[PDB]
Write an enzyme that holds these catalytic residues in place. Structure first.
Site, PDB file in Angstrom:
ATOM      1  N   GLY A   1       0.620   9.816   5.806  1.00 50.52           N
ATOM      2  CA  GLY A   1      -0.821   9.953   5.953  1.00 50.52           C
ATOM      3  C   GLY A   1      -1.542   9.221   4.816  1.00 50.52           C
ATOM      4  N   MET A   2      -2.572   9.846   4.229  1.00 49.52           N
ATOM      5  CA  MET A   2      -3.402   9.255   3.181  1.00 49.52           C
ATOM      6  C   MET A   2      -3.582  10.210   2.014  1.00 49.52           C
ATOM      7  SD  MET A   2      -7.197   7.556   3.590  1.00 49.52           S
ATOM      8  CE  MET A   2      -7.699   8.865   4.671  1.00 49.52           C
ATOM      9  N   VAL A   3      -3.701   9.676   0.779  1.00 53.61           N
ATOM     10  CA  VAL A   3      -3.941  10.460  -0.443  1.00 53.61           C
ATOM     11  C   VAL A   3      -5.201   9.953  -1.141  1.00 53.61           C
ATOM     12  CG1 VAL A   3      -2.856  11.529  -2.483  1.00 53.61           C
ATOM     13  CG2 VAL A   3      -1.450  10.558  -0.692  1.00 53.61           C
TER      14      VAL A   3
ATOM     15  N   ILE B   1      -6.619   6.526  -2.953  1.00 58.46           N
ATOM     16  CA  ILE B   1      -5.519   6.130  -3.831  1.00 58.46           C
ATOM     17  C   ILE B   1      -4.599   5.202  -3.048  1.00 58.46           C
ATOM     18  CG2 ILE B   1      -3.480   6.942  -5.126  1.00 58.46           C
ATOM     19  CD1 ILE B   1      -5.041   9.454  -5.896  1.00 58.46           C
ATOM     20  N   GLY B   2      -4.082   5.690  -1.916  1.00 62.76           N
ATOM     21  CA  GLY B   2      -3.165   4.912  -1.088  1.00 62.76           C
ATOM     22  C   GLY B   2      -2.906   5.582   0.255  1.00 62.76           C
ATOM     23  N   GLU B   3      -1.934   5.060   0.994  1.00 62.86           N
ATOM     24  CA  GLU B   3      -1.552   5.606   2.295  1.00 62.86           C
ATOM     25  C   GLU B   3      -0.146   5.192   2.641  1.00 62.86           C
ATOM     26  OE1 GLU B   3      -3.532   3.325   5.964  1.00 62.86           O
ATOM     27  OE2 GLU B   3      -4.668   3.016   4.102  1.00 62.86           O
TER      28      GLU B   3
ATOM     29  N   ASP C   1      16.067  11.078  -1.272  1.00 64.23           N
ATOM     30  CA  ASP C   1      15.272   9.844  -1.157  1.00 64.23           C
ATOM     31  C   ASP C   1      14.698   9.460  -2.518  1.00 64.23           C
ATOM     32  OD1 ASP C   1      14.249   7.603   0.205  1.00 64.23           O
ATOM     33  OD2 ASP C   1      12.561   8.729   1.104  1.00 64.23           O
TER      34      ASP C   1
ATOM     35  N   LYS D   1      -3.548  15.065  -0.209  1.00 65.87           N
ATOM     36  CA  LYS D   1      -2.985  14.230   0.833  1.00 65.87           C
ATOM     37  C   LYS D   1      -3.213  14.901   2.170  1.00 65.87           C
ATOM     38  CE  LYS D   1       1.564  15.909  -0.240  1.00 65.87           C
ATOM     39  NZ  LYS D   1       2.826  15.622  -0.947  1.00 65.87           N
TER      40      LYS D   1
ATOM     41  N   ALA E   1       3.372   6.333   5.741  1.00 63.69           N
ATOM     42  CA  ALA E   1       3.838   6.967   6.984  1.00 63.69           C
ATOM     43  C   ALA E   1       3.311   8.432   7.054  1.00 63.69           C
ATOM     44  CB  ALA E   1       5.367   6.941   7.040  1.00 63.69           C
TER      45      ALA E   1
HETATM   46  C1  LIG Z   1       5.284   9.316  10.175  1.00 67.13           C
HETATM   47  C2  LIG Z   1       4.584  10.621   9.999  1.00 67.13           C
HETATM   48  O1  LIG Z   1       3.640  10.921  10.734  1.00 67.13           O
HETATM   49  C3  LIG Z   1       5.011  11.542   8.904  1.00 67.13           C
HETATM   50  C4  LIG Z   1       4.390  12.773   8.740  1.00 67.13           C
HETATM   51  C5  LIG Z   1       4.735  13.607   7.691  1.00 67.13           C
HETATM   52  C6  LIG Z   1       5.686  13.214   6.734  1.00 67.13           C
HETATM   53  N1  LIG Z   1       5.917  14.011   5.556  1.00 67.13           N
HETATM   54  C7  LIG Z   1       6.644  13.403   4.429  1.00 67.13           C
HETATM   55  C8  LIG Z   1       6.839  14.390   3.301  1.00 67.13           C
HETATM   56  N2  LIG Z   1       5.534  14.901   2.896  1.00 67.13           N
HETATM   57  C9  LIG Z   1       4.751  14.477   1.885  1.00 67.13           C
HETATM   58  O2  LIG Z   1       3.575  14.817   1.782  1.00 67.13           O
HETATM   59  C10 LIG Z   1       5.380  13.495   0.904  1.00 67.13           C
HETATM   60  N3  LIG Z   1       4.322  12.947   0.000  1.00 67.13           N
HETATM   61  C11 LIG Z   1       3.455  11.860   0.526  1.00 67.13           C
HETATM   62  C12 LIG Z   1       2.883  11.244  -0.735  1.00 67.13           C
HETATM   63  C13 LIG Z   1       3.886  11.489  -1.895  1.00 67.13           C
HETATM   64  C14 LIG Z   1       3.205  12.274  -2.986  1.00 67.13           C
HETATM   65  O3  LIG Z   1       3.519  13.435  -3.243  1.00 67.13           O
HETATM   66  N4  LIG Z   1       2.244  11.592  -3.640  1.00 67.13           N
HETATM   67  C15 LIG Z   1       1.466  11.991  -4.755  1.00 67.13           C
HETATM   68  C16 LIG Z   1       1.396  13.294  -5.234  1.00 67.13           C
HETATM   69  C17 LIG Z   1       0.629  13.588  -6.352  1.00 67.13           C
HETATM   70  C18 LIG Z   1      -0.067  12.581  -7.016  1.00 67.13           C
HETATM   71  O4  LIG Z   1      -0.798  12.810  -8.135  1.00 67.13           O
HETATM   72  C19 LIG Z   1       0.007  11.284  -6.523  1.00 67.13           C
HETATM   73 CL1  LIG Z   1      -0.903  10.028  -7.300  1.00 67.13          CL
HETATM   74  C20 LIG Z   1       0.756  10.980  -5.404  1.00 67.13           C
HETATM   75  C21 LIG Z   1       4.994  12.274  -1.171  1.00 67.13           C
HETATM   76  C22 LIG Z   1       5.032  15.713   3.995  1.00 67.13           C
HETATM   77  C23 LIG Z   1       4.746  14.819   5.166  1.00 67.13           C
HETATM   78  C24 LIG Z   1       6.344  11.993   6.933  1.00 67.13           C
HETATM   79  C25 LIG Z   1       6.016  11.179   8.005  1.00 67.13           C
END
Ligand SMILES: CC(=O)c1ccc(N2CCN(C(=O)CN3CC[C@@H](C(=O)Nc4ccc(O)c(Cl)c4)C3)CC2)cc1
Length: 337
Positions: free
Chosen positions: A23-25, A17-19, A135, A40, A21
């Site tokens: 990680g990747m989803v 889907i994407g990536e 945010d 993710k 900071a």
């Molecule tokens: C720099 C580094 O190593 C680093 C390491 C950890 C870090 N955290 C940030 C907060 N976290 C998240 O997982 C936030 N997520 C990332 C993606 C977004 C999300 O929920 N997408 C999503 C969800 C459902 C969906 O159906 C779709 Cl299409 C997209 C928010 C924990 C990790 C930040 C930075």
């Protein structure tokens, strides 16, 4: 993408889907619960900051249950703390996000109104739990084909702490620049609910024109984009500014008149602009609260307090070493093994 995505035996058939900071989803088939889900992969254990953001994301989303907030359905990690190097978080799959939608489509007022209502409905629940998102921005508002909207990304979330909100002038901040309230640059650490209302005001403006309202190019430039539209703060608002340096700076500026909202958004609904004005109020003490915003005339067709649930109980990490945070992440994900 030649990285490693180990989610068996429950999930299969992956697609990138994407990536970012974090990680990747990917999308994947939940062989136990019918359909495709989002997964993710987070690899945070080498740094305290990444661990803090991961523990916040997990602790908060596991305690929340709301239609306009993304849930956590499952969490995959190794059976021991020693072998745990990554954490996979499973969530409902969404088709797009507001950032991507605004790059390709101009929204009608009735879409803006419905999306704003959902943002505020989810925010009411977050704030009722004494939590701040910190945010909010278009890319953190997930959307599907039936226009359901879900708030995501609680990595910078905090429990509200208005008594300790004060900080000095031009103090560094982590959340997304364009959505920062003016007080962040003047005297605030972003520990009050008003920080989120400002970000929602920025999102509403962005839905009305498909462009960010305050695109600061760097830290101080953000405050001068805000003051360039709101105009010079009143005497009453300056005498509420706390800091000597913040007061001196604002008093040193040439007078600037307010740019009317109807000149920035000549095709917008007048009730949308009245609400926008109240969310984008300079003084956080005078800024509209989430419950007031839901009750504003612009959202009158949707407003229903009996269908805008609150959290059953409020929530009650800084400098905790990455090793302790890893132990807490391990304990918080134990229920999914
Ligand atoms: C720099 C580094 O190593 C680093 C390491 C950890 C870090 N955290 C940030 C907060 N976290 C998240 O997982 C936030 N997520 C990332 C993606 C977004 C999300 O929920 N997408 C999503 C969800 C459902 C969906 O159906 C779709 Cl299409 C997209 C928010 C924990 C990790 C930040 C930075």
């Amino acid at each position: 993408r030649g990285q490693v995505f180990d989610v068996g035996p429950r999930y299969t058939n992956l697609s990138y889907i994407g990536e970012g900071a974090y990680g990747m989803v990917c999308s994947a088939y939940d062989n136990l619960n019918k359909v495709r889900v989002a997964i993710k992969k987070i690899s945070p254990f080498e740094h305290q900051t990444y661990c803090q953001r991961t523990l916040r994301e997990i602790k908060i989303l596991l305690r929340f249950r709301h239609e306009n907030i993304i849930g956590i359905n499952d969490i995959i990690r190794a059976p021991t703390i020693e072998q745990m190097k990554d954490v996979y978080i499973v969530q409902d799959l969404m088709e797009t996000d507001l950032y991507k939608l605004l790059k390709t489509q101009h929204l009608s007022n009735d879409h803006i109104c419905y999306f704003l209502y959902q943002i505020l409905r989810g925010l009411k629940y977050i704030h009722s739990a004494n939590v701040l998102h910190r945010d909010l921005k278009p890319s953190n508002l997930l959307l599907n084909t039936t226009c359901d909207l879900k708030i995501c990304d609680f990595g910078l979330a905090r429990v509200a702490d208005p008594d300790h909100d004060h900080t000095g002038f031009l103090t560094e901040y982590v959340a997304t620049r364009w959505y920062r309230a003016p007080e962040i640059m003047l005297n605030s650490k972003g520990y009050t609910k008003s920080i989120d209302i400002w970000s929602v005001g920025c999102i509403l403006a962005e839905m009305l024109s498909n462009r960010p309202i305050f695109p600061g190019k760097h830290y101080l430039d953000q405050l001068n984009h805000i003051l360039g539209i709101l105009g010079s703060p009143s005497q009453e608002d300056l005498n509420c500014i706390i800091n000597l340096k913040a007061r001196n700076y604002l008093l040193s500026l040439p007078h600037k008149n307010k740019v009317p909202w109807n000149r920035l958004f000549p095709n917008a609904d007048s009730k949308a602009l009245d609400l926008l004005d109240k969310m984008l109020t300079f003084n956080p003490h005078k800024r509209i609260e989430v419950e007031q915003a839901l009750a504003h005339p612009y959202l009158e067709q949707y407003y229903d307090p009996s269908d805008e649930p609150i959290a059953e109980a409020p929530f009650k990490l800084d400098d905790l070493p990455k090793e302790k945070l890893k132990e807490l992440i391990f304990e918080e994900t134990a229920r999914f093994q």
